[PDB]
Each structure stands twice: as structure tokens, then as C-alpha cells.
Structure 1
């Protein structure tokens, strides 16, 4: 599994890059406020190089307030980020478990046809009898997979995929809303920032805060990297959520129509110069349950030509049912 099952949908690797970017940010913030110094302080009488080395930690863990010329989110962001990264990685595992429970095995079939194509795409002798090759080796494997899956909890694989996509969209929107509930709705802070009010007057996100100690004037270095990060993370999260919602609506419309869903297969079926006996309708009657989604996956993953060859070879041996 770790070799091949663990390791390309159009704009689904956005979950992978999301996990990557959020984990990088979280781990870098941990490294910053655990290796370097996140805060500094200044008691305007005198130090001993060990006063400040304690007042730093004190004023860090204790609360700090700010006043222009005890509010802090230091204790949640670099951990809610790791939690968010884990929640972004969840949906891929959900989809894998769903395809495992469905009964069929799609990853292995894609890898098999991919290896077949990458192997005999260059053999000159095995290129004129190309359709013969495709109906010979891999087509039987795909058909046996279809046959075995048809009798075990696999008649609505597309429904499981659409549910996975719905969960992905809901998860992205929930992550964005969670980011919103950790302080100001974006363009508000940008307007207060673009018109020239950085923090002196607008108040929020301070960088020179006082400290209670029984006039300590502590400066929050690492804070300057938080409102250089949220301004980008907000935009990028809303973009990811929008693209995921668009993909979700696309797959919903695909599932609920089933009429223009066979557009690609009906297109592929009109290329080979054979058109021998099997009508268009009975091919679907034998395959339309699940094999439609699998052929669409082969097309969306391998490409178009090696998928057209496969789906036009599969007609020539389609006799298990009709």
C-alpha cells in the first residue's frame, strides 16, 4: 500500500498542497517561537540578562494588553493550523475507504493499464495490431474486475464518489469558517490597511503592547508574520473552497443526468473502422452501471488516446451479458 496504493484528479491535489502549506506554516511558527525568541520586553530601570529571560516567558504565557498613543491569539493559531491540515487530509482517506468498501479496485486497474500502455506504446511490431493488443491483455483484466465487483456492493460507485466530493466541499467551507472565527472580514482589514492605517490607530494586531507585572512595554516580533499570513490565507482558502464547490456541482450534475454522461463513450465509439455487430445501447446495458465511471476515470487519468483504444476494444469482447 505504502508503495503504490498510497500514491491525479484535476484540482484535487489542492488538498495535498493545502496540507503542505498549512503544515509548513504551523511547523515554522512552532520552530520560531520554540527556537528563536518570539517576544522581547523592556523594564525601563535595569536588567541582569536574566530578568528579561524570565519576563519574556511570563509576559508570553500571561496576558498582554495594548493602548494607542489581556488579548492574544498566540496560543491557538499554530495548533489550529495543524488541526486544519489534518482535516484537509481526511477526505482523501475517506474516498479511499469508500472505494475499498465499494468492492471494486480502481487504483490497481488504472496502474495496470498505465503500465501496459507505458510498456507497449513504443514497440513497432506491436503497433499495427494495436487494437488486437488492447482487446488482448488489459481489457480482460478490466472486464474481470467489472464482473467480480458487480456481485459485491458495487452498483452505485458514482454515488460514493459524489458523496466524497460533497464532503470535500463541506470540509473546505467549514475550514474557511473556522478561520473566520479566529480574529475583520478580510477586505475590511485590507481597506483599513490600504488607506494607510497599519496598527497605530486601527488597534487590532498590535506590535508594541504593555504588560502587567507586580510599564513593561513588550514588543511582539512574531506578530508581524501573522497579519502577513492571514491576508493571504483568507484569499487562498476562499479560492480553494470555490473551486471545490464548482467541482462538486459538476459531479452532482453528472450523476443526476446520465444522458450526456455517456457523451465521451459515445464519442469514442465512433472512431474505429469496425462497427461490426454490437449496438450502442447493449454495450451500455452491459456496462452502464459501474464501468461508465471507471472508463471516465481512465480517461481523466491516462489521457484520451489510450482510453479510447481501451473502450473501443472492450466492445469487441462484450459478451458476458450481451
Structure 2
């Protein structure tokens, strides 16, 4: 519960359902650690001649490492062996699922504007004096003094260092996310042999919901024979788990794809439109009863390079009410800039 906490609870990225990669890592790591641990008896074999308890402890290993085969109980083309495949390809899947978070962190470090620190700053500020009755009716000026100047200084200091298209870097991160999810699903498809039957939810379920476990479908057995060179049959207790999770995992994996690529398009149409991207800010700026000097045009031209993305991240992490105040205050203070 400590490593899962290290990967899930302790780091704070509250992205829009992009904690699905962070939870997929946990799911696949749990699977890969619970499979090869052998439920601490994967396979047990029987040769009806004699058993000095030292034949069995060896022939088990032999039929495990050396491939087995299967025949319908009534031709040996079905040579089932995917035990050197799965319990490690799953860990590899977990690692390739975690990669894009590292890519995005490194990319934001290259962009030159530490976003996580700014989010945490506005967060502990909004949680520090949300309860001060005295500093609540001066709420606008309150947000004007302390944090707004900080965010603005960060903007000034980043604008001169490779930070005018941070949204471009982010949308590249998310398109990488989507392509990664599709590649993981495709690899899962060809996991068994890519020449013997390939698995996927609907077909295997529909077959399984007609009473076709293995005695009539052949594929996916649980009683397999292994030869011996100088035939012995045995029960393969592990297959009773694999399919009973492949049918699950497959479905779930598809879900991730469907929830990532869509999240890609929302983050590309944005980069294409640039006239409805400013809709949330233009909405926030219609709540202050001051309307003093600045028009939203010059405000955006002084802000619209990167400030839009940072304001979106603020509105996504902190909520909305503690973001409208921030943006209206940043409009108030943006006097001596443009």
C-alpha cells in the first residue's frame, strides 16, 4: 500500500481523467506481480507409473519451461505456450503507460515555467485565507496583492525562455498519450501467438456464453499434454485465471483508448480554433461590476500566448470560483504591461 501510494496519492496531478494512466499502471503492476508469484502451483503433471516425489518436482519444471501442446479429446498444431510472454510483457506495458507523465514533466521543465509550483502556491494561498472573515470582503484586492503578482512575474520570466507555445507541447504530450494507448491495445491483441487465434472481448465472450469452454472450442485449454525425450498429461491451473482476466482487461483497455483519443481531440480543436479557446476567460470577465479600463482584446494580446493554458490548468485543479478571482485580478493589475 506504500508503493501504490507513492505512485497514486502522493504526487498531485489532477488532470482530466488522465489519472487513468496512473491507475492503469497500478492495475497492470498488480497483475504482473500476482501472476508470476504463482498465487503464493501453476502446473501439475501426472505420469501413471510411479511417484517418488522427486519425479514430480522435476517433470513439473520440465513441462513448464519446455512448451506443451493440446489435442481435443476425441492434430497437435495447438502448441500453447504463453508463460514466458505474459507476466513480463504486462510489466513492460505498465512502464510504457507511465512514460508519458515523465515526458510531460520533462517537457514542462524544458519550457521554462514550473507549473506545479504555481498551482501549489495558488492552492495553499486559497486554502490559507479562505476562512479569514476580515480578508474576505477585500477578496478582489486580496487576490490582487499576493498571488497575482507571483503568477505575473512567472509569466514575465518565462516569456523570454522558449515559452510561447506551451499548449503545443501539452497537446503533443496528449497525442503521444493516445498513440501509446492504441499501441498497448494492439500489443495486447497479438499477445498469444499472432498466428494462432487472437483474442478480443466480443468473440471470446459470445463463445463463452454458449457453453464452449474448451471441450468444443479447442483454443484456451486447461488440460494439456507434454512430451518427454530421453507423453505425460497435466492440469494447467493457471489458465483458469488468464482468460478470466483477459476478457476483463481487454474491455478496460479499450475504455482507456476511447477516453484518451477523445481527450486528444478536445486538446487539438482548441489549438486550431483560438476564438473559442478564449471562451472561459471571456466568461469569467463578465462577473465583476467594475468594467474599468481594459478591453478583452488588449488583455488577451498581453496574455493570450501562455496565460490561457495556465488559467485553464488553474481552473481544472483548484476549481472554478478560486480561478475567476485570479483572472479578474490579473486583468485589474495588467495596467503597466501592454
Q: TM-score, normalised by structure 2?
A: 0.92
Q: In structure 2, what is the Cα distance between the partners aligned to 1:176 and 1:182?
A: 10
Residues 112-144 of structure 1: per-residue CA shift (max 9 Å, x gap): 000000000000011010101000000000000
Residues 38-91 of structure 1: per-residue CA shift (max 9 Å, x gap): 110110111011110110001100111111113210111000000000000000
Q: In structure 1, what is the Cα distance between the partners aligned to 2:116 and 2:245?
A: 37
Q: In structure 1, what is the Cα distance between the partners aligned to 2:23 and 2:297?
A: 42
Change in CA separation of 1:320 and 1:32 when aligned onto 2, cut-off 3 Å: farther
Question: 1:282 Cα shift?
Answer: 0.7
Q: TM-score, normalised by structure 1?
A: 0.96
Q: In structure 1, what is the Cα distance between the partners aligned to 2:169 and 2:226?
A: 55
Change in CA separation of 1:312 and 1:163 when aligned onto 2, cut-off 3 Å: same
Question: 1:4 Cα shift?
Answer: 13
Instruction: Choose 63-72 or 23-32, whichever is displaced more.
Output: 63-72
Change in CA separation of 1:320 and 1:165 when aligned onto 2, cut-off 3 Å: farther
Residues 202-248 of structure 1: per-residue CA shift (max 9 Å, x gap): 11111101111133111110111000011011100111001000000
Q: Is the 8 A contact 1:5 1:107 kept in 2?
A: no
Uncovered stretches (5+) of structure 2, i.e. residues with no partner? 74-78, 193-198
Change in CA separation of 1:179 and 1:5 when aligned onto 2, cut-off 3 Å: closer
Question: 1:321 Cα shift?
Answer: 2.6
- What SS class does the counterpart of residue 261 from structure 1 fall into? coil
In the alignment of these two chains, the number of paired residues is 320
Q: 1:288 aligns with which of 276, 294, 304?
A: 304
Q: Is the 8 A contact 2:35 2:87 kept in 1?
A: yes
Q: Is the 8 A contact 2:200 2:247 kept in 1?
A: no
Question: 1:195 Cα shift?
Answer: 1.1
Question: 1:186 Cα shift?
Answer: 2.7
Question: 1:33 Cα shift?
Answer: 6.7
Q: In structure 1, what is the Cα distance between the partners aligned to 2:144 and 2:133?
A: 18
Instruction: Choose 59-68 or 213-222, whichever is displaced more.
Output: 213-222
- What SS class does the counterpart of residue 37 from structure 2 fall into? helix
Q: In structure 2, what is the Cα distance between the partners aligned to 1:203 and 1:71?
A: 11
Uncovered stretches (5+) of structure 1, i.e. residues with no partner? none
- What SS class does the counterpart of residue 53 from structure 1 fall into? helix
CA RMSD of aligned residues (A): 1.9
- What SS class does the counterpart of residue 33 from structure 1 fall into? coil
Q: In structure 2, what is the Cα distance between the partners aligned to 1:95 and 1:239?
A: 22
Change in CA separation of 1:186 and 1:255 when aligned onto 2, cut-off 3 Å: same
Q: In structure 1, what is the Cα distance between the partners aligned to 2:95 and 2:66?
A: 29
- What SS class does the counterpart of residue 50 from structure 1 fall into? coil
- What SS class does the counterpart of residue 235 from structure 2 fall into? strand
Q: In structure 2, what is the Cα distance between the partners aligned to 1:38 and 1:234?
A: 23
Change in CA separation of 1:212 and 1:159 when aligned onto 2, cut-off 3 Å: same
Question: 1:187 Cα shift?
Answer: 1.4
